[PDB]
């Protein structure tokens, strides 16, 4: 979708510093705890009944890393979001049946975590850009839906 070029540059320079293990684990964890209906999709992961057990669950941490990794393939491929995520959009829709509203929820939590980790470096203007990216990923995962 784009958004600008001084902009893409600021987004790329932040990702340089993103620890996908750490951010992804927390982001997925955040999701499971704030929005608890999303727990339904991760039953194979075992105990998710409380905040301590989610955040400390090794499968959560591992899946989170995998999610933030694909987010990363997104950030490095903003010209072709719809192509990068096609396979994944079919997986989430045809197979797992996740309502796409939840993609938005996860992208927002992602933004909150980046904000927590980077502090005053995560400027309003920088969040602005990431809101775009996250919206881009979410739409691309909703697509080749049917």
């Amino acid at each position: 979708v784009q958004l600008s070029g001084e902009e893409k540059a600021a987004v790329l320079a932040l990702w340089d510093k993103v620890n996908e293990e750490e951010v992804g684990g927390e982001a997925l964890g955040r999701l499971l705890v704030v929005y608890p209906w999303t727990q339904r999709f991760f039953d194979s992961f075992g105990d998710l009944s409380n905040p301590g057990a989610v955040m400390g669950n090794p499968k959560v941490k591992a899946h989170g890393k995998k999610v933030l990794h694909s987010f990363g393939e997104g950030v490095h491929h903003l010209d072709n979001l719809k192509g990068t995520f096609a396979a994944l959009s079919e997986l989430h829709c045809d197979k797992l049946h996740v309502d796409p509203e939840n993609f938005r929820l996860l992208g927002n939590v992602l933004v909150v975590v980046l904000a927590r980790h980077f502090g005053k470096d995560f400027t309003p203007e920088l969040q602005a850009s990431y809101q775009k990216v996250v919206a881009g990923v979410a739409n691309a995962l909703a697509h080749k839906y049917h």
Binding site: R30, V33, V34, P51, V111, A115, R116, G119, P124, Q127
Partner: protein
């Protein structure tokens, strides 16, 4: 919708926010105007530049209101009625915009209170802000 634990969580979190509620309110407004352009619409009479006195003064009013709600959590409907009439009846704010401001509020809190913004506390804050929003759009439902 607010359980005892959530009320405890919210009261505690906000105490850590202290005298900054005003500043956070203004920053949250900024992050909204920049990240979700559609919301700039409700504020024509406003200088939306990036360190403007109106957003700052407006930011203070929002923080003041959120503080009030924290001290009224068991009767939010009563304490926020002036505010509900304004947003729903006069300004006819699209309810989606409350979700957007809420997200930006949590974004701000995370920036300035990273150690206190734990998962448990984030969840309770989300619940709180969903409840403030629901009252502020009740002239709808």
């Amino acid at each position: 919708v607010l359980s005892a634990a959530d009320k405890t969580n919210v009261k505690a979190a906000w105490s850590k926010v202290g005298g900054h509620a005003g500043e956070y309110g203004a920053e949250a407004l900024e992050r909204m105007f920049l990240g979700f352009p559609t919301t700039k619409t409700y504020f024509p009479h406003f200088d939306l530049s990036h360190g403007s006195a109106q957003v700052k003064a407006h930011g203070k009013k929002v923080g003041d209101a959120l503080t009030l709600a924290v001290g009224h959590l068991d009767d939010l409907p009563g304490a926020l009625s002036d505010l509900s009439n304004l947003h729903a009846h006069k300004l006819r704010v699209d309810p989606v915009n409350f979700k957007l401001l809420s997200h930006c509020l949590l974004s701000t809190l995370a920036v300035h209170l990273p150690n206190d913004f734990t998962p448990a506390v984030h969840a309770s804050l989300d619940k709180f802000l969903s409840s403030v929003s629901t009252v502020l759009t009740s002239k709808y439902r």
